[PDB]
UniProtKB/Swiss-Prot annotation, chain A:
Included range, full protein: 529 to 940 of 941
Protein name (Swiss-Prot/TrEMBL): Endoplasmic reticulum aminopeptidase 1
Subcellular location: Endoplasmic reticulum membrane
UniProt record similarity statement: Belongs to the peptidase M1 family.
Role this protein plays: Aminopeptidase that plays a central role in peptide trimming, a step required for the generation of most HLA class I-binding peptides. Peptide trimming is essential to customize longer precursor peptides to fit them to the correct length required for presentation on MHC class I molecules. Strongly prefers substrates 9-16 residues long. Rapidly degrades 13-mer to a 9-mer and then stops. Preferentially hydrolyzes the residue Leu and peptides with a hydrophobic C-terminus, while it has weak activity toward peptides with charged C-terminus. May play a role in the inactivation of peptide hormones.
UniProt key word Coiled coil: no
Tissue specificity remark: Ubiquitous.
Length: 398, 396
């Protein structure tokens, strides 16, 4: 029930529609040769009429912080081109807005993934956190949808794309600790490393092997620590050594080792964590929800955390209330990345039989997120298969 | 990066060697094994022993890891492979060798003569990926030549380039109907032919253009050939003028945009820079791509450079120094230089802007200081190598 303020410009005649995905809408914008910000308030349609004729127009609807803008064809192509050559002209949070809405409209069915992606390609030049983060925030859920389906080829290619994009910025991070922002941008080191960018997955191994070769006495930078452990847990000696430290020793490493422990393709170890977390003795049950969410997020262990959750639901609600923050969160972490009608009806088929235990906001919120996923992917899989098979192509004449 | 992993082989003894404390995960395929093998060079040098003897071996498979391979003793055997049976290797791997071959001409140890030889098999190359690689390895050479007074060698190269691609150039149907990359090859090969003045592509493009003009652009042009069609139309005032009328679709502009900057009309080349800057008759947000493209133009290159320096105070204000934008511009106006005089022209300008000390500048100078000595070393070798390709030399 949020806005959907369609925009059609002709010359300096700026028409704008209303469908509000009536209402009342305190539109804001920034034009091309403006270096300033403007005011307006929409009936169904209106026009405002621009003073001078200008090249591009960026509606950042002054409605609180959340708004949905659509400029259709030519309009998005004007903006796509601004970022692709002169993205510095606009701000970081406007960098975000664009990226955010570009993808919003893809799932709403007013913009095609081909185009929302044919934009993400400028991020190779983005040297700021906010847009990069946004980018990842919109692009990551796609491939996690893929991870839960027969899709190795396009998964891998997507990720290559994603890493290929970010590489420059990845490659210029010192392995140390900038401001609260630069240090957090850490996330790249991890993400690089998780996806096998090899100058990442070679130095982390180094840092890890040494660290454990002092029984974890080396001081690792905090920023690096996640990547370091994330490659560590991919080997049996790695998992075990790091897990011995978890119990034996601090507050933040905990989380970092907690996070890094679940990032394992070992189906045995994984099962272990669900199990013991459940108890409380080895891993305390105070953080079973988080462990369950992350395992759901694993590429191999997604079917475990759902299976476990179902096989032992009767006992989770005795231990975490029938419907609560934890429980809801748990429901959603083991189901909302499913992209099949086969997963959907199981997700429906389970909860719609608990009767007394069966109809919470998390249940019907999740089914929908899956019913979106089904349609989204059906529409877009084949599309994004090619958009990537049509990107690594002359990625210079005369 | 830039580890240089030297490979010497005697029988089954396969010696690595290292260059710039590196740890290097090595991978390799042979004439016996299609399988990508594994080897971790952690020490400076090492060896391995292949199970049986091999006609050839090749390292860094599919270009997955960042190391460049030079084959000692070697390269000769990898050539004859591609010259006789290139279908035995894979497509991505055909690219590797072309990249590397020419790469190692950068740093030496491999002569231009031998790298250029390798590129000869492309006469039979029936796949997007290697074709492209060969183009974008060879092209940046005659781009360096265009910016000097080496016409006879420039033209001789260019013809060569075409002669090389020709059989495949004539194979493209002037339509769309194709899968991905299939349609991209026609896209790009028709252009190349046309720009280098291959007549059968220049004559077809004049026709398509001509009849399109005789319709007020109401003629159906296939997307692929559109570039070539326009690329040759803008070589006359009636065609440049016409296309701009059309300029003022989301993709049509880009072709007409590109096709415009090809004109050797240094008068209207100026007009594009000037009016792109204003933002009125062409967008301001498009000055980066028009400046970089005028950079490449064999006759207009000086303007785009000249315009930048004469007008640098308004671009740094308009787009902000140290941007994606400004760096792209600096490097596109200057990276194809290949003389000492041009060097001091770069160093002289940018360093005098007081605070100058940013990536592109430091980056460009390095790119030109590498050009200079590349050309010193290679121009003559290439001059004479060309004089020999033409040698069909069929006896008995």
């Amino acid at each position: 029930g949020f806005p959907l303020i369609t925009i059609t410009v002709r010359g300096r005649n700026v028409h704008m529609k209303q469908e509000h995905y009536y209402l009342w809408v305190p539109l804001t914008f920034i034009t091309s040769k403006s270096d300033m910000v403007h005011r307006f308030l929409l009936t169904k349609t209106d026009v405002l009429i621009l003073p001078e004729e200008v090249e591009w127009i960026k509606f950042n609807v002054g409605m609180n912080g959340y708004y949905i803008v659509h400029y259709e064809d030519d309009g998005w192509d004007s903006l796509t081109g601004l970022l692709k050559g002169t993205h510095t002209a606009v701000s970081s949070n406007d960098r975000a807005s664009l990226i955010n809405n570009a993808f919003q409209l893809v799932s709403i069915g007013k913009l095609s993934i081909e185009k929302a992606l044919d934009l993400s390609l400028y991020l190779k030049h983005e040297t700021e956190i906010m847009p990069v983060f946004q980018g990842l925030n919109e692009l990551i859920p796609m491939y996690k949808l893929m991870e839960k389906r027969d899709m190795n080829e396009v998964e891998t290619q997507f990720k290559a794309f994603l890493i290929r994009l970010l590489r420059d910025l990845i490659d210029k991070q010192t392995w140390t600790d900038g401001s609260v922002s630069e240090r957090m941008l850490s996330q790249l080191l991890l993400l690089a490393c998780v996806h096998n960018y090899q100058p990442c997955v070679q130095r982390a191994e180094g840092y890890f092997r040494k660290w454990k070769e002092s029984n974890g006495n080396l001081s690792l930078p905090v920023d690096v620590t996640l990547a370091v452990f994330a490659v560590g847990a991919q080997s049996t000696e790695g998992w075990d050594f790091l897990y011995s430290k978890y119990q034996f020793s601090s507050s933040t490493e905990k989380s970092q080792i907690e996070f890094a422990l679940c990032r394992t393709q070992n189906k045995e170890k994984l099962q272990w964590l669900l199990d013991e977390s459940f108890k409380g003795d080895k891993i305390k049950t105070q953080e079973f929800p988080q462990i369950l969410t992350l395992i759901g997020r694993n590429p191999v262990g997604y079917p475990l955390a759902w299976q476990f959750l179902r096989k032992n639901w009767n006992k989770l609600v005795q231990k975490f209330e029938l419907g609560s923050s934890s429980i809801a969160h748990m429901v959603m972490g083991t189901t909302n990345q499913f992209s099949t009608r086969t997963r959907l009806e199981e997700v429906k088929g389970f909860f719609s039989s608990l009767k007394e235990n069966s109809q919470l906001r998390c249940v019907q919120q999740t089914i929908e997120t899956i019913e979106e996923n089904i349609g989204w992917m059906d529409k877009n899989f084949d599309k994004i298969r090619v958009w990537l098979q049509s990107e690594k192509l002359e990625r210079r004449k005369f």
